[PDB]
């Protein structure tokens, strides 16, 4: 299947409390593998997955130097934006960035992207052509004109198509035992009373990897997608994932509803009853 390398960056100002909080978090697929946090006692880029032990000390030194440089650029950005939006120095503000690339099972590039937000709203983004930018407001249009005259897109494209892809392949190779594994979901159904002669049926899926899964409830061969409550698939603390899906059904009629679990670790989908 496909794979991704993604870097989530966040800078948060805190007036009266010193410099902004700055964080970078890297993911290969849905697994955290590196992180930088400016609030650490000695801020360094650090491994977050076991297989990153295969990188030498030069790797960590280089990533740490990038992070400290990036941190400074976002401090300046935070100042600049107060001018752009005529905001006071007293309020806290947030920059977010997502950068990444995705490859097929053969290692070839599928797509690359970079998108930015200010205070939780789109600011500027690289278009799918990887040549032009798209800006959400007047402030972002200033930024766009700057990046165009500096040729920033060309530099970014070279990273997304070359460096990003090549390192993703390396991490997939180095982290093969972790990243290319499949852990099959284990499923069960719980039952809870409600008022008015109705019952909540909840189907659980536990201990699975990778994160992509489908949980559906059925009554007589039709899916009850519109009547389901769900949680977003969520990490379980040990590198695996879990999810649940519920439906409200008439008391006494529980036996007619079935939960269906689809996952790459399930040659045939699971079918469960209460």
């Amino acid at each position: 299947g496909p794979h991704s390398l993604r870097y989530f960056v966040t800078a948060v100002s805190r007036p009266g409390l010193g410099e902004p909080r700055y964080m970078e978090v890297g993911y290969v697929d849905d697994t955290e593998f590196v992180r930088f946090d400016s609030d650490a006692e000695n801020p360094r880029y650090e491994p977050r997955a076991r297989w990153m032990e295969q990188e030498g000390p030069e790797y960590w030194e280089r990533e740490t130097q990038k992070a400290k440089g990036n941190e400074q650029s976002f401090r300046v950005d935070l100042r600049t934006l107060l001018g752009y939006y005529n905001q006071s120095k007293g309020g806290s503000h947030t920059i977010q960035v997502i950068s990444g690339c995705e490859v097929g099972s053969d290692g070839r590039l599928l797509r690359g992207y970079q998108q930015y937000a200010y205070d939780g709203c789109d600011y500027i983004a690289l278009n799918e052509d990887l040549k032009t930018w798209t800006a959400a407001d007047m402030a972002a249009l200033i930024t766009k004109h700057k990046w165009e005259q500096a040729g920033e897109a060309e530099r970014l494209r070279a990273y997304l198509e070359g460096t990003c892809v090549e390192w993703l392949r390396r991490y997939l190779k180095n982290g093969n035992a972790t990243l290319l594994r499949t852990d099959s979901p284990k499923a069960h159904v719980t039952h809870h009373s409600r008022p008015e002669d109705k019952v909540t049926l909840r189907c659980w899926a536990l201990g699975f990897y990778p994160a992509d899964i489908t949980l559906t409830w059925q009554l007589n061969g039709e899916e009850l997608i519109q009547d389901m409550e769900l949680v977003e698939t969520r990490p379980a603390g040990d590198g695996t994932f879990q999810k649940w899906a519920s439906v409200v059904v008439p008391l006494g009629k529980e036996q007619y509803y079935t939960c269906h679990v689809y996952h790459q670790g399930l040659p045939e989908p699971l079918t469960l009853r209460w």
Partner: peptide, 9 residues
């Protein structure tokens, strides 16, 4: 391998 340059806004 993280992006090493985010251009100033």
């Amino acid at each position: 391998f993280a992006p090493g340059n985010y251009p100033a806004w």
